[PDB]
Amino acid sequence: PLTLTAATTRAQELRKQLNQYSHEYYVKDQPSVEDYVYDRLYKELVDIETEFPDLITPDSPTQRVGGKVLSGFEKAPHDIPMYSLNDGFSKEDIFAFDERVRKAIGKPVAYCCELKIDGLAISLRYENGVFVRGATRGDGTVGENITENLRTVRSVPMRLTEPISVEVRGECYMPKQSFVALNEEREENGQDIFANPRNAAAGSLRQLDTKIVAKRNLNTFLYTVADFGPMKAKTQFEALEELSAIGFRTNPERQLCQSIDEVWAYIEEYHEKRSTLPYEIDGIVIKVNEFALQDELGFTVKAPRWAIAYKFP
Ligand SMILES: C[C@@H]1CCCC[C@@H]1Oc1nc(N)c2c(=O)ccn(CC#N)c2n1
Ligand SMILES: NC(=O)c1ccc[n+]([C@@H]2O[C@H](COP(=O)(O)O)[C@@H](O)[C@H]2O)c1
């Protein structure tokens, strides 16, 4: 028989060890231990939580299966607005963007280039390391509060290793394989299929029963912060590294490009790498790397002047 005193301590040990394995597997996409190692520890933890339910915590990995059912979503304000992107569709559009940027800044400028993840924009707020809100972008200043759903998204950390208070933003999406699998399941049960993974991700995040969401195999790539503060990055490329460092999943395919020509080369590179990716992209996002230069260019009503989305036709 395990006592409550012994259980309380052991559960924390298990949470920590299981969450680390989960970080490796779900965020770094590189598990260190064999699944049975994880499964055996996880069952030990379930046994403890079953026997002493009071030991269940929000950062325990058993909570990933969800359980909550909402009546609706609360409004989720974004005091720091979530903008959208200006678009370009031609080589010319991208070079014109660069020409306008140089005209404004007065010198050559480096670009951080990222794949444009075809999904939904999300915002994740942490207080003292604890996940406390997840939100859709919505209309840019108000989205929906989908905190409970995002708890089931395995790459989203429930507790960061460092008790940092930050709100990070990125994309939540459904991998191609999961998209295919989910549509087959819908065909089998007489449901209408989703037209594409973007729509499947959106419908999934709109579900009110978290237990169903937990089954939809959603994933994330984080690419910015709303409010910096403790963050030390001074360039986007630094921001991507820092996001990884503090425990978020980031897309590995980014490159710091020192000329607009390098940018065009990146676009052509991944335009042909496109189909080999396990996820859908609808283009490339080109960002002015230096945050100080981003500030200098500012924002239109709709979008930053320091970035542009090259859309695949
Ligand atoms: C520059 C813009 C606007 C200001 C906030 C930051 C944002 O950058 C960015 N980066 C990405 N990698 C992606 C992406 O993959 C998929 C969709 N969007 C649109 C959104 N939200 C991305 N936006
Ligand atoms: N470190 C690992 O090898 C590792 C970590 C998390 C999940 N998994 C696997 O993922 C599947 C589902 O696990 P969870 O529902 O606990 O996230 C299981 O088959 C489990 O073995 C493996």
From Swiss-Prot:
Annotated catalytic residues: K116 (n6-amp-lysine intermediate)
Assigned protein family: Belongs to the NAD-dependent DNA ligase family. LigA subfamily.
Lineage start: Bacteria, Bacillati, Bacillota, Bacilli, Lactobacillales
Protein name: DNA ligase
Sites where the protein binds NAD(+): D35, Y36, V37, Y38, D39, S84, L85, N86, D87, E114, R137, E171, K287, K311
Stretch of the intact protein here: 5 to 317 of 676
Role according to the record: DNA ligase that catalyzes the formation of phosphodiester linkages between 5'-phosphoryl and 3'-hydroxyl groups in double-stranded DNA using NAD as a coenzyme and as the energy source for the reaction. It is essential for DNA replication and repair of damaged DNA.
